[PDB]
Amino acid sequence: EQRFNNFLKALQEKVEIKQLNHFWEIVVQDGITLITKEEASGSSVTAEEAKKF
Structure with missing residues (x-):
């Protein structure tokens, strides 16, 4: 979950x-x-709200 999550964040930023x-x-x-x-939580939901827009 976490490795692919940060990979997804990196590639979507790219x-x-x-x-x-x-x-x-x-997209x-x-x-x-x-x-x-x-x-799971924490930085996950925070990043979700930060990158929602």
Whole structure:
């Protein structure tokens, strides 16, 4: 859970800089579901609320 969670955070941060003809804007509007890492609690929910927007 935690290793893939921080990996997901790293890769979503990385994809959040490629400004192309199509990019993570679709992933932005994909915020209808879990788009931020969550391991058990604590830093998980805090990072979720921080990266919700």
